[PDB]
Amino acid sequence: AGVGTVPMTDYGNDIEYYGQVTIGTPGKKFNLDFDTGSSDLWIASTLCTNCGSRQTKYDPNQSSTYQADGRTWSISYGDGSSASGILAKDNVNLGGLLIKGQTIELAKREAASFASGPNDGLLGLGFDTITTVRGVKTPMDNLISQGLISRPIFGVYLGKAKNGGGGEYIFGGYDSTKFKGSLTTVPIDNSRGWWGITVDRATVGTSTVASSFDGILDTGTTLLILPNNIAASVARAYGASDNGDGTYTISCDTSRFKPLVFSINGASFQVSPDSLVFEEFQGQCIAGFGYGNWDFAIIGDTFLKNNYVVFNQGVPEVQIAPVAE
């Protein structure tokens, strides 16, 4: 693949996307979940006492460039998952770009959800204002300062399992074969450390199901999570029923559904009908949108797998366009 290009693997029915990253010298390959919703780079290690036997574990002893650090870390994600351990320093190879002296976080303990998952850790692509440890420079911070990328951006393509899956991240550039038409520039609000944007409105057919609302672009979240009222309004348009746990049950037949359209900075972006259904279990289909008790929306994979996004940490801003398919 090209310089700074990282092929992604689509896990299950568009649950998450992970890519291989080489850490250490000579180094091992790890499957990391690329998450724009957080900013810590942590991986399972041989110091871990409750990690999965299937996870590839970082071994300090097998890396000649490992450097001990006396600090500890602990993180707790929204979905209730967590992990903790100690900090360390080593080289990270991202798509051919060798980041020297990156602060990495070795897990000593991790939630069962991670132990049973498909990834060896997470690669945080959020802003450095939310690293769990103060003073830690993120991979993007280092790619920039070490001159590994000329433009402070990364292009993101997330494929759909129904089309063969896959996906691709390009650090320092983007791929126009992955989207159609012109890219639309959207200003970013990073006041909370996330990639926040404002959606002008959401419509289904001729019905305006929601007025302007804020949200964060999160590659690390499967669904499109909307604030209570907005979610209920969307649900009513499709006839979905509340499962009481933050998810909705929807008709498995999406052939009659109109797309959920978001108006952002003057352009239309949608969640195609097929994406309105996330998973089907024993004849029951769970919707691609859900609800949380937040004032803002978490714009996850349901939306991102339908729209190519160029993240620009420098401005900051994003450029969006419908995926080519």
Domains defined along the chain, listed by start: 6-174 (2.40.70.10), 175-323 (2.40.70.10)
Which one of 10, 40, 141, 218 is the catalytic residue?
218
Backbone angles phi, psi at 181, to 5 degrees: 80, -160
Contact yes or no for 215/299 (Cβ under 8 A):
yes
User: 272 in the Ramachandran plot: left (φ > 0), alpha (ψ -120 to 50) or beta?
Assistant: beta
In one-letter notation, the amino acid at residue 148 is L
Closest of 225, 239, 210 to residue 290, by C-alpha: 225
Determine the Cα angle at 207 with ends 205 and 211, to 5°.
120
Altogether, the residues listed in the chain come to a count of: 325
Rounded to whole angstroms, the Cα distance separating 42 from 24 reads: 14
Give yes or no: 141 in active site.
no
Rounded to whole angstroms, the Cα distance separating 307 from 318 reads: 12
Cα 45 to the center of its chain, rounded Å: 23
How far is CA 272 from each of CA 101, 182, 226, 288, rounded to the nearest angstrom?
42, 19, 17, 10
**Structure determined by:** X-ray
How does DSSP assign 56-121, residue by residue? --B-GGG-TT-EEEEEEEEEE-TTS-EEEEEEEEEEEEETTEEEEEEEEEEEEEE-HHHHTSS-SE
Rounded to whole angstroms, the Cα distance separating 192 from 190 reads: 5
Give the three-state DSSP class for 158: strand
Within 8 A by CB and 6+ apart from 270, the residues are 259, 260, 261, 262, 306, 322
Tokens of 291: 């609800």
Give yes or no: 33 in active site.
no
Helices (H), 100-188: 112-115, 139-145
Tokens of 159: 């494929």
CA trace torsion 17, 20, 22, 27 (10° rounding): 120
Which one of 33, 35, 90, 301 is the catalytic residue?
35
